[PDB]
Design a protein around this ligand. Structure first.
Ligand SMILES: [Zn+2]
Ligand SMILES: [Zn+2]
Ligand SMILES: [Zn+2]
Ligand SMILES: [Zn+2]
Ligand SMILES: [Zn+2]
Ligand SMILES: [Zn+2]
Lengths: 331, 328, 319, 323, 339, 337
């Protein structure tokens, strides 16, 4: 029969953005394995006031089992589409959609529906970064503990400097994806990462001023997850229209060394390999989303264009169409 | 940007429209008519069968944008709006048909550009005499750039089963070819269309037959619609049969019953494609650029260089052929 | 505020409805019937052709508001809601037709107030017409029949056979075709001119207390609506209908104008207004949605005139 | 044929508010002349993050060319209406609309779609003269905003705040493209409304507005509407305004400034007491100098004695540039 | 923790008509057992031109498994409602709905989505037994499903031409009985009214083969063979131009031992004794209106009232009221009823 | 037909409205006010916080129909239309809340019938360390200088709020009016347990209180106290929790008296006359999931019997049916003597 995971997703009326994001998540082996192991039932959180009563996790679990059964070449994700439209109506209709916006929604929704914290409970003052980061991560896990935290969550350092009182505010914050700005001739992914970590003048509230100030902000990468989701910020949502950057960003297929951008000098080496890409086409109108993904069982690359699954070659993956990159850490 | 290499943005389930529009855009006698920009005197705003010249004007405006060489892609917003206003069946989010839109547009453009300001209003006689009469009568009601570009004549012979022969010559602006009841040739579908098939209100007997179609005269631009869709109670079915059609040198003289007629050799200029089978579905187009002679693939906003070896597939739904004219 | 001098607020493209409602408001036999407030016994809630008495009730309520003398204008929200519920085609911001709403309302009010609880299933013209009218009233008996219903003769002459088939049919308004400034009598003559396969000629037999004359200005084409802008000259006083009445033993028929439904707007959605003569003071007013202003007779006859309301003179005794 | 500019606009379902605003702008000669000269194509800004990719300027230019061709007595502004409802869906509703709200949208929209500043780059002046601080404020405004809209409708007003504790006088100069005038409480003159706008409000500091520089085209919005939680209120006060010779010089603070005499060119009118209401316009035709009444598709000759009524909502004045 | 089958259905905005019909079908044991035993999987027909590509059968199977799992006290039938609306959009409006109209749609839909026939291929003066056997066999050569096996019966149609006096007899299948109500009545009076001869009205005249003309012929129905599950629809609604009328007549019907044998014209037929299993109820008359259901649980033999999401224990004395609209009867198949 | 025994037709998911309307209909001081038909002089059409008198007029018309004795049921079309026009959130086929409608209607009726034609502005006195009796009297008088209507006279009470800052230990005491009490349910319970829980001190969570001495949003302690109670006490049992993606519902059986509810022990004011209440109406909710359904129990003022109002259907009830998990909003009438 059909090879497991080589399953297209039927377009049900401008759901290409959803399908693209779903193919990327489907080919995230730690996440697919978790659901296929079918022991996640004990972790479904139906009372969580921030979740969807376990219903997003259940519709997702059902769909992945279909996609990895080896019985179908394609499935129509009707239950999943219905559940998304019910909890997040902004994803329904026939206007311009965003694979990253849906991805952010799904990563948060799966996390709360599978959150092991049944009751959520409820300040760097020149202390070492290692101490402040450990504290921030532990406090994060006291509120958020799931397969999503274990697979996609990392930690970044935020430094804010007030222009009035010159007070330097350092915080450690979790992330489940990295939104990379593109420079304003092709660019390298490392240039986009360096741009993300370079200081920029913003507005946030200063605790000493008590007012909103146009403070400088600098990001630093502290710890990185098993699955690094890299969002290339191509879209600009202006008041009356959406802009798109068509720049070719060169990104490695294999051996992405993240270690040079990690400010923790005592940290483990971070080498990553590409597993999936969410692609966008269409300078004008609604546009279209597809995906490249590496099948975990045979190690080959494929193109997923809604219901159509075709064998791909690595030389096709790096184009201006690349929008969201999925990287898996080599452990 | 090269003129005519202009993608059309999808405005929400508008692929059916964009596909049809790319085929019409790459119909040189029609595009040249609008780009010559002298058609303003021919806009018919009083025609009771037209859309007050508004479909012709929205189409003229879009073509000028598509052939300006200023844009790589255009969102056909005014055109989409005007279509939805006059023909609301094309504005839902349900499955659409590139041919249904094409038939609407060909009729609408004809009426909005009909030179006839006031429309006025057979038995054992020679075919040549009856055909000349039917055509002259047609142009006394219908005279436009659409009649000049796409209209042909087909002979219809109906034989009564009780009293035993009614011959009529009727115009057409496209040919809907039935597919046989898997790879078939275009010529087999043409032969199927012209074969006598028993099913009409007869005047001699009055007891309401063996209908037979014949091709009499063919136009500059022959639009060939392959009847792939069928409509079941709860869903639309699609025939996925591969129809083999020539890219160059389609000899239609072979199927023309007028033996004194001019030779009819056609070359492919555009194809409306359909993918999806029994699911939601998507339309694209192949079109040969009149200025550089190369084949391009138009997938909504995206325009990419194509090769001839990609064109003949099960995806081919509507074929556009241009007649070879060397002092005929 | 003088009773009846009440404007109707526009509730989003509802001027067509207000224009129609102002003409009916200023039809004295109909308004008096609702103000008399004894019509409650005549509301037919089981009629399969009616709206369970709900259009009559919404209309009665609105007319009482319009003739109370307490308001200069009212927003006919309940009426608009009830119309939109039973006839959803009258909902939206597309081009509307005041005659289409009028025809709906005249039929609706008739069925909601129909006294017939269970509808049953070579002679001289006078005998056949009397029979046709009595049979019509055995199915249809209401204040609308009493105020607006007339009878017209249909003569069909068969060729080859030469058989003359005569029928008498009721009407509650006359749709008059326009020729091609024209006179109303030319449009009446055009309606009565002769046109299996046979010749058909309309003739007017008996005419009602309130004659509603619809000038067929609109042509609904496949993709657009056409409009005839011809100035139709119609009398304000003394319309003699007697010359078009084929019953030679019939009473004289002289009418006086009481209301006009007006339409403006060459392109787009357009706008409907009304001229109406107030029954209590005899003056002409212009009803433009919520605005009611004193009018002069010299303003009434224009290309804007679309539907004319005429009241028969029952002054001198006839038969 | 038809006289250019005497073109009605068809109602496309509750679009009278739009037609009224459009007739006022159509009869603003410096703006219509700019589009009819048809050289504005080089000024269309398609990359502006605050614009509509040039599409509101293009839909407006196309419509104004139709209205001033002399070929049509009326046009249905379908493309314009469609583009407006696409960028600003609040105007594509079915509820009571505001011609001033559409005007403010369109003035900003046209400015951004025609903004000469391709890359946009709070300063307080301490003890410096008003003339120096105002010149600075205007130059800084034009470094961000440079269009036919700035050149036609933009003025500058002075804002003075004085602290009741330390007696500190804080002066700022801010641009405007129209004046929203409050109407008095307890028939009023336009000058009373202007004086009310420039009178010091006790507000914990006192705030006073002053007119510094005035544009070629002065748009005066009479604040008739009050948007309450469940309903909109309307002031029916008759505001007396001059048709010719409005002397604005008395309200201008720059005492070294040029005289400011204005003539009325257009009025946006509003009617209706109970329902959706209706908008029309009075406008002076620039080619024959006569007054006309534009009621959607209908254009009729008007007289000066008809303009000043309670219906007057938005007034358009044109400065006399005699020398 | 919850008893299987005692599962309410959430209202998803005017869907009470749908919940009511679904509770009746859910409590039809031969149909529920078919889905719970996974007998449906191999029989899903996806190419049938008269079906919904197996999608209505799949959505129904999934829902019935949820209702009979014993895990939920109530479920929101979102997937089912979505699939129904997609194939039959008339059921997704906010206008008044009809549980019988949904039932007829669903019985036909499931039949076609589960039809074992993958490729679908006068009778005068002959005995009724011969013609009926032929009509049934020809029916099953086209229609072979769990729906045919559970709900299909056969009725005799006699048409008599008023001109040539030609008597045309046909045997036609049915999956429910629409009973006209007389102009408190007994169910047997409604059955007798259904089998009484009536003269045809326009625009449905009978085409006479002798006359070769459309005729105002007489039409008489007779019951020939009855199914395991007899669905009896009391025709309470009248669709008028501007509103829907409703007959509020109390129809007295048995809860147990309904003897159908007296209305069966086949004298050699097996006895037909039926017990009520479910009732689709309607309240509201000519106003908006609400649908509920009475159903007998197959595992404990008790009567329950299903009012959307709410399931409560009922008593037999509550069942026979003016609210009864659609009745579900189950035939007795013991040693007492041999053929 | 007995007056007041009038059902309300459902006009498409309007059960939430009919339930609230049946409770208000059977509030004798309010129905008597409209039936006396002298309220016309009190309709406030200029109030910027009202609906130009239109909600009061639509309500008056409906209550006269329901108490005429001519109809067994009425379709409240004008009322539903007016509600949908001023508050569009109450239209549609999604889950509704009878208390949300009730709160809207109580405020709308108050503003449409507000005797204060021009609302004044006066500073609220510091009320620092002064006796509770003095500060409460001041708060009530200031409330009536802005709000004076049949709604204030029938449903308004006063509650005391004590806020204590965790940084500066500042004790802020205020008295605020209420037209209903939202009672929290413990995380079968008695009504008195929910009343006691409403007056227990709680610490504000992740909604802090602004402090005047700190000049910052502080997570202070908040304690409520009942000061004065109205003629008609509307008790809202807080069963629903509106979470980001779903609505939670507490199905706890709250035991509440039908007769003799002694409120005096929960009133921190001792100068008040005893407060004894009797149940007059209950708004009920059914439907664990989906859209759900609302009905009402109500005691007829003319015959003293209990009835069940399920949209258009009105049937005789027994007291033993009223106290169930379905009870959501309770209407209590004070004993006067
Ligand atoms: Zn600071
Ligand atoms: Zn024949
Ligand atoms: Zn004859
Ligand atoms: Zn100071
Ligand atoms: Zn016969
Ligand atoms: Zn403090």
């Amino acid at each position: 029969h059909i090879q497991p995971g080589l399953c297209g997703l039927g377009n049900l009326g401008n759901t290409c953005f959803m399908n693209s994001a779903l193919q990327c998540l489907s080919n995230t082996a730690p996440l697919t394995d978790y659901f296929l192991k079918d022991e996640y039932e004990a972790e479904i959180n139906r009372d969580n006031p921030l979740g969807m009563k376990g219903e997003i996790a259940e519709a997702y679990a059902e769909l992945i089992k279909q996609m990895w059964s080896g019985r179908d070449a394609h499935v129509a994700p009707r239950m999943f589409k219905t559940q998304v439209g019910r909890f997040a109506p902004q994803f329904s209709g026939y206007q311009q959609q965003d694979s990253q916006e849906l991805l952010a929604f799904l990563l948060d929704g799966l996390h709360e529906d599978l959150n092991r914290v049944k009751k959520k409970p409820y300040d760097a003052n020149g202390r070492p970064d290692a101490v402040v980061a450990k504290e921030a991560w532990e406090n994060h896990r006291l509120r958020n503990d799931s397969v999503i935290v274990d697979t996609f969550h990392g930690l970044f350092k935020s430094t804010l400097v007030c222009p009035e009182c010159a007070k330097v505010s350092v915080t450690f914050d979790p992330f489940c994806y990295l939104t990379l700005p593109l420079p304003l001739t092709t660019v390298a992914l490392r240039d986009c990462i360096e741009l993300f970590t370079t200081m920029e003048t913003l507005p946030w509230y200063c605790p000493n001023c008590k007012k909103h100030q146009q403070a400088t902000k600098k990001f630093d990468l502290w710890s990185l997850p098993k699955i690094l989701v890299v969002h290339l910020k191509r879209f600009s949502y202006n008041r009356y229209w959406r802009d798109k950057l068509d720049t070719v960003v060169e990104f490695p297929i294999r051996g992405l060394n993240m270690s040079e951008f990690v400010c923790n000098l005592s940290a483990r080496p971070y080498v990553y390999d590409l597993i999936a890409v969410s692609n966008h086409y269409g300078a004008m109108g609604v546009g279209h989303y597809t995906a490249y993904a590496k099948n975990k069982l045979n190690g080959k690359w494929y193109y997923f264009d809604d219901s159509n699954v075709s064998l791909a070659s690595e030389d096709q993956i790096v184009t201006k169409a690349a929008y969201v990159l999925f990287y898996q850490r080599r452990d």
